[PDB]
Amino acid sequence: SSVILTNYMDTQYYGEIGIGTPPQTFKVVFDTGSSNVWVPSSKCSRLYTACVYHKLFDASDSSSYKHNGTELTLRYSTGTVSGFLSQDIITVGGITVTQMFGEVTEMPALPFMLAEFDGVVGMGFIEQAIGRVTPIFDNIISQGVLKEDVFSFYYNRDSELGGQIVLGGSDPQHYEGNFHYINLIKTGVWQIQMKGVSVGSSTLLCEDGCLALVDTGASYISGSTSSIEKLMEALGAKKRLFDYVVKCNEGPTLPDISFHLGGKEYTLTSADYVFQESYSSKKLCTLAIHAMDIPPPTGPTWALGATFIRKFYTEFDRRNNRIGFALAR
């Protein structure tokens, strides 16, 4: 089963799932960086403007809904949502599973007013599930219908299909060459060891090694503030409140950036990481890379998000506890 994804500005990739009976539609990001499922709730006060601008789950319109009520707070690197737990049937690309999910009643305008998606479907491990709720993928695995204990991500470059997630395998039409796998530094987190990061001809970063969280829910590639400051000075990039920019006319000639993963160098060109919207020396162009200090136990760690995934098709293998990469097509 595959879910078609929409690509919003190269920063938000989301697909649709249906919840309840009849099905209530929601746009959601499939996030390997988290393990809970949640969507805005009809019980979310309208004083939360984000709830006025998104699809709301209304339990009182679903006959398959099962009440629970346990409070839960989900905090991401760029924001937090709070609400309570509920159960209902969820449809994900043809597959139907009874799932426990969060009904969000507190959804801060910043950043959710800037969210094209409604909610999130965590593709992480139960170990990181808040409230210890069984993740949706584990519930699908329990059904014994998927040919493989794996799911795959394809994120296209902007245009005008925005992307695609395959549950139970990979789609050969979206990658070439063969996968190369890196075992997880531990079960319960889609994090792998990274042997180094090079900018131009000089492995000036992550010498001695570091961690790499492969996060489908992260828009960019991130590193600790320290690491990023060093990466950016090398790029001649200037820091702003939320990001790093470079004079657009300089964009095209910025050096490659490679990530040493499992004995293979994964390289991105400036075209892969700079939002080239002009060539004017008078304008600033943002880079799809920035600081993000991920707290323990996960971090300190780098995060390989959409910027990385656009170039490398990614397969998350639950059975063998590893991640595989292949050149996206």
Ligand SMILES: CCc1nc(N)nc(N)c1-c1ccc(NCc2cc(F)cc(F)c2)cc1
């Ligand atoms: C999909 C869930 C999620 N997963 C991970 N692993 N990291 C995140 N930062 C988020 C996450 C992403 C976007 C948002 N809000 C949307 C947004 C954020 C922003 F930082 C700037 C914007 F313009 C719009 C909230 C949480």
